[PDB]
Amino acid sequence: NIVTLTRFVMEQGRKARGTGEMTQLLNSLCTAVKAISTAVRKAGIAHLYGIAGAVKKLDVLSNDLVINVLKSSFATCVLVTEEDKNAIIVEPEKRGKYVVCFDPLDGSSNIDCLVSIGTIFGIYRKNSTDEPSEKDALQPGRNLVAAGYALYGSATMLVLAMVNGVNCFMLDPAIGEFILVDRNVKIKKKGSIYSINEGYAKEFDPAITEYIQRKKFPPDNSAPYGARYVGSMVADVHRTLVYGGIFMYPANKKSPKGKLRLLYECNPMAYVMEKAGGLATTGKEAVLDIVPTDIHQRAPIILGSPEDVTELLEIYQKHA
Amino acid sequence: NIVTLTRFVMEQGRKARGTGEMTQLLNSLCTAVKAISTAVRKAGIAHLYGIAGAVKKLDVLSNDLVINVLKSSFATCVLVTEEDKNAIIVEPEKRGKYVVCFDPLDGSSNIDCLVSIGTIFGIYRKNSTDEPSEKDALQPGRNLVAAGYALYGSATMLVLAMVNGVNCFMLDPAIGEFILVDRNVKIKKKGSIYSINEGYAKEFDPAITEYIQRKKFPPDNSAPYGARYVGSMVADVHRTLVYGGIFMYPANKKSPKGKLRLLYECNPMAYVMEKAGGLATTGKEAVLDIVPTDIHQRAPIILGSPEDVTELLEIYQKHA
Amino acid sequence: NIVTLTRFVMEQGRKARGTGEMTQLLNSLCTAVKAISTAVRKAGIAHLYGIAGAVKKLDVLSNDLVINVLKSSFATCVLVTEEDKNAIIVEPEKRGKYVVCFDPLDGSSNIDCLVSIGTIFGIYRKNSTDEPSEKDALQPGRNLVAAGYALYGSATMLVLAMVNGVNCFMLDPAIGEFILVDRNVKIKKKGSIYSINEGYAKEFDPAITEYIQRKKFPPDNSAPYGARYVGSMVADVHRTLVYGGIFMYPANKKSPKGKLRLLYECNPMAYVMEKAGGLATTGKEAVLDIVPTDIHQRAPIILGSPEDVTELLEIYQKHA
Amino acid sequence: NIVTLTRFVMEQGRKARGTGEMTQLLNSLCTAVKAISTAVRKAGIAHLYGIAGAVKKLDVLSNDLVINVLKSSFATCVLVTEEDKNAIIVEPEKRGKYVVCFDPLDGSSNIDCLVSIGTIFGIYRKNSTDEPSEKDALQPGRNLVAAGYALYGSATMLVLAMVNGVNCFMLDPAIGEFILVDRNVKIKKKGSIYSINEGYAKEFDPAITEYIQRKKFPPDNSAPYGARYVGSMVADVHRTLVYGGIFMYPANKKSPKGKLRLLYECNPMAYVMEKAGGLATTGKEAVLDIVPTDIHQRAPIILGSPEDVTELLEIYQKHA
């Protein structure tokens, strides 16, 4: 009773009576993630180092792989990449109805020191009948059909959230299959870890400043929270999902609108947190309700266990 | 030309005119690290999920692979594991002269959320003419013949430090060969990242507190440091070696002698840092000079780029 | 423009407007073949040999893997295995409409000396509405919906024939995907290799005896045919498919009805040869037209390039 | 306990008190065979089929991997390849004392239909005090220091024969390690399989003809032998070593000096057969005693179980 991702997606497409265009897209996504995972684990590196006698940095190659494999699903009309200034309009022969927003290799500062990196994606349905253009990507994350990420960590995991729930799949690289290892994931209501880059403590607003303080010096004299900040949003959000706690990347003054991008970092991760029973907020509003105006717009985000996120939203409220 | 770890170790053994007993040992570490890497990446997991009809949790397995493959080398007499209450004395039939101190899977809290984990090891030459015992492991780190670690991060890397210097080997998993990618590694003199678990801020001593303060609000008005703390010592020490900066786990009033263990976490990493041109101090003395009195003794450690560690030792001096 | 087997099967199921039950079955088949290929290449063998301190012969395990993965496709009601005396009736919860006939590891005498072995399968649609029983498997191969084989040779290849043609897919074991490498395969009209076990020359009928003779001593004094007989039907039929020539395993007197079994050796391979433009005959009739009476019935078979098979059928005719 | 090939070669080198130059060489063969095995199994093929948007045919690549990884050993002075018109003299900077004769990918006709293929090698110690030349390769096979082959069949196996005997190592591709699975291999005294290309029956001499006749129609009325002929010498010789029997490629009147080459096909396999207790004859003399006069010279060879080869030498004597 092994459920593979291939079996799971097809079963879901059949219960939903899709024409199979969305199933084709998700199957292409699973193929693109396995190919990236293999290049990230450095298979074939001996050839660069001349094992047979005698370039593509991993993020450019992860980008070429997601664009090609997704264009050949015949299921997308618009692609937005973290790595590309403009939205990619798929050629008419290869068009389908979906819009995919992705970060091809997340945790750019973490690539060379070999810490966990990952791929983040969100899928929208084209809501118009005109030529595909950037406009089709500019939808609130509330409109996502599916979103998720693949983590290339000690093992590779693909986490997929759709209307029905969040499920986690582990890649068995011996057979190239993702196996369902966690069905219907729900985040703990309260965690014990907070995750933020405190080197920006000087630019933090008073509510963040107050909340961190409370985590280190708890008023009630319970144990302080542990701190963890891997530096790759994928890696820090996955641990928040699996262990609980809170992850924050607020507006500071170098990034006054936050550093993380809305369509392919914040919205995918916000949708997974909400399908898992957590909250994802800007501090003032829910991330999935923002209507973007630029495909590379930034938003501050705080996401994680609902009691921890509620505790910080109450501090935001008493500072107005 | 492709220098594999097997070619490198055999040539270093030839230069040194060793009998070949330490080359057999280093070759046995290379095999155990490859077998742990494959298990960590979850190859064969489908069989656990019933793919063929019809769990040695990853740290017990890593522990069992290092002890067995190292007894089979005929090169060791005493083995000290993070996982083991007592020193393991190798049966006289497999007995050789080296003492191997190791942490088989570091970053215990990070195993389940799939963040980078790793193996740490230090090798001593047995010095007594007595029967092998715990005592042959209780040598200052200054007496280490070789030390290093394997990081199972986005790719698997082995870093080996011997008298000659520090060399980095990348595993090419397609051929099961460690390839020399970075020779005679030297840490940057000053970095821009500090790494510490700030959840313990209530229990830090005043030189640590003052130092974190200067990193966040620089008195000379230079730019603040970035913060990173993955939570696995191997991953944080490895990013410190490759990018620079400082890593700290001081005594807090929960772990008043520090948390990390001297024989198999602090001494191996101190020895690597020192052969790469950096420092490793308790804040009061050099880690490699401590005379161990217990195989599971703990020590504080501060390590990293020479200028950053020196800056903290200055602050430690204006407070005593 | 890579076509993977997953993309190809789904596209074909959509053009045919299947409910997706056949697509699910073929996706399970692709997962079962990858798992067998990995166990055949001996991944993990170091664990039998005690790498970590401390049974299922490859054909019993290949059998357990095909039965479990096919039962969990929820698409089969009857299974017939080379290795099982009785047909397997799938439990009602897991039932679907298809009947699958398979040889789990072909070339039993070739397993231990490591020569090419393979998996052979044929799929029928249940043509009745009564309880599944052996009767459902007893259909002429003319009724096959899909048939094919996976060869675990120097590389792993899956050859799949359905009404529309024969296509060959190569496993890239680095990502676990089968990639379409040969579309719409057609066998050469005449080949230059004959494949038969000549150690039975004493029991051969006069038409076989005459035909071999003509291959070694050609009347017209052209070049003799080369001989090849790997000993695994999969391996010998695949070379016949790809290079042309003829493969024969006639009735001799130890196997007076031939040695090869009809439902899971002869019919699958006969269907592939006919979709590829070749012939497969008993010598008297076409193999796919035999109506079987026992699920483990044997049939002689001669298959391959049509001019070569016609030349031997003309000799059969002048010996009556 | 797990004996890897790296552990075995290093201990044999220690027993023999070698300087370590032949251990470096055998370790370089183990690495080149792992890299050819991965290429043969087609890992990374998706990249050729455009998975990332945007061939060194397998024998050229195998050739380039053996020469490069062997020059990098600093252990060879002359290399003779099946693929190379002339002997390769290693640059004085990489020059050592051994002469390596090899066939990089044997079974050229079988590469495209994916039947077992393999690598064959023989190592001589250079004997002249002269500048290295073709001449140091022209030594009788009796002067070989080590010989063996790698078979890329259903699993990858390395068979190594040195003075001590023949040992078989299975590649565990999950960890990239060759594991000792069969120690001091001895061929059966009499087998029940004969292997020859009978398509040449018109050109065989009368002792071969008579011998095949006795195998098919036994005069003492014992059971006929089975016939097997894969078509790749490594695969057929390997099945002869493990099951027994006889392998023959006599001179036919197309190849009157035989087809297989003395330095890198016949001598390596003869040396393995002899260390396993079997025979290797041209029909007239022992293969290992022939004095080569050309690095690409051909010889007939008959090899296999002692009683079967002796039976054929008897027939060869009643005809001259």
Ligand SMILES: Nc1ncnc2c1ncn2[C@@H]1O[C@H](COP(=O)(O)O)[C@@H](O)[C@H]1O
């Ligand atoms: N594999 C899938 N699993 C989840 N829901 C899907 C699946 N396939 C399609 N559906 C649902 O059906 C809609 C249209 O399917 P489609 O015709 O394939 O584009 C999708 O946008 C989903 O809401």
Ligand SMILES: Nc1ncnc2c1ncn2[C@@H]1O[C@H](COP(=O)(O)O)[C@@H](O)[C@H]1O
């Ligand atoms: N492979 C090696 N590379 C580095 N130094 C080694 C090597 N092998 C041995 N040596 C040095 O020589 C000493 C004795 O070698 P051994 O006889 O093998 O125990 C060791 O303690 C090292 O200091």
Ligand SMILES: Nc1ncnc2c1ncn2[C@@H]1O[C@H](COP(=O)(O)O)[C@@H](O)[C@H]1O
């Ligand atoms: N993936 C497939 N490719 C080939 N034809 C198929 C495919 N799926 C289904 N069809 C055809 O449609 C019939 C019924 O499909 P199904 O409802 O899935 O059982 C099959 O028996 C085939 O003839």
Ligand SMILES: Nc1ncnc2c1ncn2[C@@H]1O[C@H](COP(=O)(O)O)[C@@H](O)[C@H]1O
């Ligand atoms: N690893 C080895 N195993 C078998 N015998 C070896 C080994 N290494 C060297 N010897 C023997 O010792 C000789 C000289 O060793 P070397 O100094 O390395 O060239 C060789 O020609 C072999 O006969």
Ligand SMILES: O=P(O)(O)OC[C@H]1O[C@@](CO)(OP(=O)(O)O)[C@@H](O)[C@@H]1O
């Ligand atoms: O160094 P800081 O400022 O903390 O930024 C890290 C954040 O930005 C991202 C976005 O791509 O990393 P990075 O810039 O290194 O590429 C996230 O993965 C991560 O959470």
Ligand SMILES: O=P(O)(O)OC[C@H]1O[C@@](CO)(OP(=O)(O)O)[C@@H](O)[C@@H]1O
């Ligand atoms: O949770 P904190 O207290 O920060 O401790 C993490 C430190 O301890 C160690 C030691 O084993 O991790 P862990 O307990 O999770 O196994 C180090 O890897 C790590 O640097």
Ligand SMILES: O=P(O)(O)OC[C@H]1O[C@@](CO)(OP(=O)(O)O)[C@@H](O)[C@@H]1O
């Ligand atoms: O030894 P012979 O009689 O030639 O039989 C081999 C034939 O039978 C099969 C059937 O399973 O092999 P085997 O008995 O060794 O298992 C075929 O793969 C093969 O073509």
Ligand SMILES: O=P(O)(O)OC[C@H]1O[C@@](CO)(OP(=O)(O)O)[C@@H](O)[C@@H]1O
């Ligand atoms: O076709 P025949 O004449 O039987 O020759 C096959 C023999 O020659 C060799 C020598 O290289 O194969 P091939 O030409 O196909 O490369 C051997 O592997 C094999 O045993």
Ligand SMILES: [Zn+2]
């Ligand atoms: Zn990012």
Ligand SMILES: [Zn+2]
């Ligand atoms: Zn640890």
Ligand SMILES: [Zn+2]
């Ligand atoms: Zn069979």
Ligand SMILES: [Zn+2]
């Ligand atoms: Zn050859």
